[PDB]
Design a protein around this ligand. Structure first.
Ligand code: 3PE
Ligand code: 3PE
Ligand code: LFA
Ligand code: LFA
Ligand code: LFA
Lengths: 158, 100, 101, 54, 480
């Protein structure tokens, strides 16, 4: 379980690094799908089986399909490759590195008994979701309705 | 057997990668892609935290996070389609006239 | 960790790698051997698929623990599905799910 | 030497300082979304560093 | 815990607003009637206020591991509902001028009111996250409701990108806090730390990322640069709803979070919030000095007023009257910003189209509409903190809370920023009574007019006579 976790984490990091630097949008979305598949593998390593199934079904299988659809209908800044020359990403890269080093300083120093990896099934997640999480479920349906209304209002052609 | 610290650090790495991808790109599409990276990293961190304690709450927060990610991706791609159909240009620095 | 579960893990891994290797070898033998010589409705449909897929995930999570949730959970899913059907009805009547006007 | 009220001018100096500071601060409202995201990340860095120091 | 019938009797505004959403949506599916759908929205919000009265007849209880309802929650729910009702009232002439679909605006406004109610009753990280998303994404729709307008599309893109980034920051911070604490309840955020170990770095960094997200949502420096562009680009009723309802609901749930979290009295977070409040007050007041646009000026004003609110928040655990000060200030700020952005709304109504300019030109407003000039002047004096207005009563409350907690740097910041505010607010008012060089007839425009006059009368009356509002806020104590 540690083996799959570490290879999938490394694949996700590498794929994200190719995502944020690539020039072709379809290639970047393909690397993003690869990173999502790796993150699902990480979820399956931890025992969150429902989370991994949802990472493939919902994130890679719906959201990235929407991004892919938008890129295809765009038929697509690319030529100069601004983000490749160091005079553009000199600042943001070290800024993100400083933020990352402060965050991982906070990570190092906490109680860590390790993750057992015992599978938390989707049935227990359903009992929790439809037990002590009634208002999260109803208002999450409410939120998705809001997003649907907004995206139809903005994205229709006329 | 897996440390919580390593999963949290992996989520932090993906979060800061999404943040710098959000900043450095003039194209709005790559900005939306970086936003998706950041929110997926946050959801991953919640899954790691929930799986460490043996609780269902991490996957529940993951479900709420991906609901948010789906809705925000929908709205952002609608706005990107509007920008492309009204300006024929996805340069985000051209959308800058309000200032002062 | 029983012997059966690690046997099934090995079988699943072998199934994965044999399927992927068979497809890749099939294309490799195809290439190596031989003789050389849009409207916004698409975005709306994909977007509706994404939103209703997340609602479907909530229904997935409910469905596997019906006997452990009672009638209260049925009521919870009842307002959930009622709001889902209200949104679907809204999309149908406003012409969002109408490919031909 | 005292026909133009020098004490009044010295007490009017903070108004000049306020106008200069406001004009300097208004340069950061350039209207660029990328700079707004960059300033959010800079503020995140500052807040995290200040919280880790104390 | 589970749900009882009495727990359903402690849940009515949420259900009423949700059923209003469903009913308005089905009525849109029936037919596209602007009048009927707007009326159904305002009856639903009024019924939610009456439901607040009915749950005020009931007691205070923990309705979920998520929700907790007490008089604190009813007060913030009432503020959010009043803001939403004013937004619908101002939006009707604006949407009358808008030559596209109009009732989706009301659907998103109601959904955002639902999220504000959730934030008002939130006692849990999941509920706080969900309420923040529920007020954010309808605002993505509403800020760019007139997406064909180039300024509104710019504001929509800016607010959507920056709020998605802030939601990512807040979610990451919540994940780190849950990684430390092991419980998403507010009262357990630091419970497993004892013997002076309250300053654990993971809890502090998680709270820092949440502070980044929330301070974006509260227009706190340096997460404030979005505020003038988004305020100016958004529709004027949308600017009203943002400035009142979103900031009030998020600051209420921030008040609750810093109240019941045991990590709320750590010195590091207090010092960081003090620096943020100081910078917010000074920067907003200094940046509003040379503004000729009323919407950008009100954005900088919102930055300064949220700095004053933060000053009231810092003195929570040291003092006692801090939450009462926050309530009184929130009432005064709600009425003042309601009146101000309401005059901005009615003078920009009806909507003139995506191509026509929405410039205000407040100079000489008295010589063609005297009463709106009077109400604009009254709210300009209220946001300045002149003693004849309730904005001064809030300023006096936060000054008393800063004096009691000996926050002398923040008190001096309040005085200096107040003087700079005097300059720019009085410039706006005297410009209203200047001479303009050169340059309606319905009853909903008159409804917006009587709304801003009622807000002026309330702020003036509670400026001269503040005791009823003080006794209203004081009885709204929560479950300690
Ligand atoms: C080989 C070197 C690298 C070569 C290049 C990369 C190839 C892909 C590498 C990643 C995927 C495979 C990782 C290795 C998995 C091998 C099996 C394994 O380790 O299983 C352990 C565990 C079994 O389950 P459990 O009951 O917890 O057992 C623990 C102890 N009994 O398993 C689990 O708990 C979960 C098992 C993993 C999750 C399912 C599979 C996820 C696949 C993700 C693919 C991502 C995209 C790859 C793209 C490649 C091109 C860039
Ligand atoms: C004796 C020392 C101990 C006691 C100290 C007592 C302090 C309180 C009493 C004294 C206050 C002094 C204020 C001085 C400035 C007064 C305002 C003023 O002169 O405004 C005029 C000026 C606008 O002029 P105009 O040319 O029209 O502007 C360009 C656009 N047309 O306006 C401007 O240019 C902008 C004005 C901005 C707002 C005014 C400045 C406020 C600064 C902070 C004041 C608080 C006290 C700070 C410490 C003061 C010194 C000790
Ligand atoms: C064992 C027999 C039980 C019979 C009664 C079952 C139902 C009782 C509890 C009903 C709870 C309903 C909760 C509805 C929440 C809706 C939230 C909407 C938010 C917008
Ligand atoms: C406490 C509130 C104090 C300000 C009230 C402002 C509104 C009062 C009613 C309107 C008065 C208008 C007077 C206009 C006079 C213009 C004179 C021009 C020629 C010198
Ligand atoms: C740019 C505007 C700057 C405004 C600064 C306002 C400063 C006002 C005066 C603050 C004085 C604070 C004194 C604190 C003394 C604390 C002593 C503690 C002893 C234990």
């Amino acid at each position: 379980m540690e083996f799959a976790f570490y290879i999938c984490g490394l694949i996700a990091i590498l794929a994200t690094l190719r995502v944020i630097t690539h020039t072709n949008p379809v290639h970047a979305l393909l690397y993003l799908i690869i990173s999502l598949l790796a993150i699902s593998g990480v979820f399956f390593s931890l025992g969150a089986y429902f989370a991994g199934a949802l990472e493939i079904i919902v994130y890679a299988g719906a959201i990235m399909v929407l991004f892919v659809f938008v890129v295809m209908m765009l038929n697509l800044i690319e030529q100069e490759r601004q983000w490749l020359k160091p005079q553009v990403w000199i600042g943001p890269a070290i800024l993100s590195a400083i933020m990352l080093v402060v965050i991982v300083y906070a990570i190092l120093g906490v109680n860590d008994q390790g993750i057992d990896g015992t599978p938390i099934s989707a049935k227990a997640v359903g009992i929790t979701l439809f037990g002590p999480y009634v208002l999260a479920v109803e208002l999450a349906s409410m939120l998705l309705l809001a997003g649907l209304v907004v995206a139809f209002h903005v994205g229709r052609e006329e | 057997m897996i440390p919580l610290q390593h999963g949290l650090i992996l989520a932090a790495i993906l979060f800061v990668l999404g943040l710098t991808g959000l900043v450095i790109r003039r194209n709005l599409l790559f900005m939306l892609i970086g936003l998706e990276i950041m929110i997926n990293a946050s959801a991953l961190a919640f899954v790691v935290a929930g799986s460490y304690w043996g609780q269902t709450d991490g996957q529940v927060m993951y479900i709420l996070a991906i609901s948010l990610a789906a809705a925000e991706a929908s709205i952002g791609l609608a706005l990107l389609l509007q920008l492309h159909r009204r300006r024929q240009n996805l340069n985000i620095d051209s959308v800058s006239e309000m200032r002062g | 960790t029983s012997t059966e579960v690690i046997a099934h893990h090995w079988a699943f891994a072998i199934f994965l790698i044999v399927a992927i290797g068979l497809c890749c070898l099939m294309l490799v033998g195809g290439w190596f051997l031989g003789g050389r010589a849009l409207s916004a409705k698409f975005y709306l449909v994909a977007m509706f698929f994404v939103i209703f897929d997340v609602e479907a995930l909530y229904l997935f999570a409910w469905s596997t623990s019906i006997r452990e949730s009672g009638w209260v959970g049925f009521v919870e899913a009842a307002i959930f599905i009622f709001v889902l059907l209200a949104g679907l009805v809204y999309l149908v009547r406003i012409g969002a799910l109408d490919w031909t006007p | 030497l005292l026909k133009r009220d020098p004490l009044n001018s010295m007490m009017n100096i903070p108004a000049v300082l306020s106008r200069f500071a406001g004009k300097g601060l208004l340069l950061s409202e350039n209207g660029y979304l990328r700079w707004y995201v960059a300033s959010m990340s800079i503020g995140a860095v500052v807040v995290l560093a200040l919280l880790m120091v104390l | 815990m589970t749900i009882t019938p009495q727990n359903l009797i402690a849940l009515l505004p949420l259900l009423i607003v949700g059923l209003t959403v469903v009913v308005v949506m089905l009525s849109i599916a029936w037919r596209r009637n602007h009048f009927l759908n707007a009326t159904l929205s305002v009856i639903g919000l009024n019924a939610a206020l009456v439901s607040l009265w009915f749950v005020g007849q009931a007691g205070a209880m923990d309705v979920t591991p998520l929700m907790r309802v007490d008089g604190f929650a009813m007060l913030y729910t009432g503020l959010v509902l009043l803001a939403s009702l004013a937004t619908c009232t101002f939006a009707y002439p604006w949407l009358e001028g808008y030559n596209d679909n109009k009732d989706e605006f009301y659907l998103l406004v109601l959904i955002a009111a639902l999220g504000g109610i959730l934030l008002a009753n939130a006692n849990h990280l999941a509920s706080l996250f969900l309420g923040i998303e529920l007020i954010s994404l309808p605002l993505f729709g509403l800020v760019g409701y007139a997406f064909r307008q180039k300024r509104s599309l710019e504001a929509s893109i800016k607010y959507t990108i920056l709020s998605a980034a802030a939601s990512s920051f807040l979610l990451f911070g919540m994940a780190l806090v849950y990684a430390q604490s092991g419980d998403l309840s507010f009262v357990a955020l630091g419970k497993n730390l004892g013997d002076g170990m309250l300053n654990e770095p993971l809890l502090l960094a998680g709270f820092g990322l949440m502070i980044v997200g929330l301070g974006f949502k509260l227009s706190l420096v340096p997460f404030h640069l979005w505020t003038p562009d988004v305020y100016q680009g958004a529709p004027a009723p949308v600017s009203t709803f943002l400035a009142t309802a979103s900031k009030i609901a998020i600051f209420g749930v921030v008040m609750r979070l810093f109240l019941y979290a045991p990590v709320g009295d750590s010195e590091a977070i207090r010092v960081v919030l003090a620096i943020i409040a100081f910078a917010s007050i000074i920067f907003g007041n200094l940046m509003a000095l040379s503004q000729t646009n009323i919407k950008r000026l009100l954005g900088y004003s919102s930055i300064s007023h949220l700095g004053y609110l933060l000053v009231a928040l810092i003195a929570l655990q040291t003092g006692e009257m801090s939450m009462e000060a926050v309530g009184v200030y929130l009432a005064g700020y709600l009425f003042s910003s309601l009146g101000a952005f309401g005059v901005v709304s009615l003078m920009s109504s009806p909507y003139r189209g995506p191509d026509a300019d929405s410039l205000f030109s407040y100079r000489g407003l008295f010589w063609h509409r005297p009463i709106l000039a009077a109400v604009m002047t009254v709210m300009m004096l209220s946001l300045a903190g002149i003693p004849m207005t309730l904005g001064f009563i809030g300023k006096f409350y936060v000054l008393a809370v800063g004096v009691q907690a000996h926050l002398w740097w923040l008190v001096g910041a309040v005085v200096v920023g107040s003087a700079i505010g005097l300059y720019y607010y009085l410039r706006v008012a005297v410009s209203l009574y200047l001479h303009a060089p050169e340059q309606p007839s319905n009853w909903q425009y008159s409804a917006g007019g009587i709304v801003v006059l009622i807000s002026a009368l309330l702020v003036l009356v509670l400026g001269v006579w503040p005791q009823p509002l003080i006794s209203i806020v004081r009885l709204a104590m929560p479950l300690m």
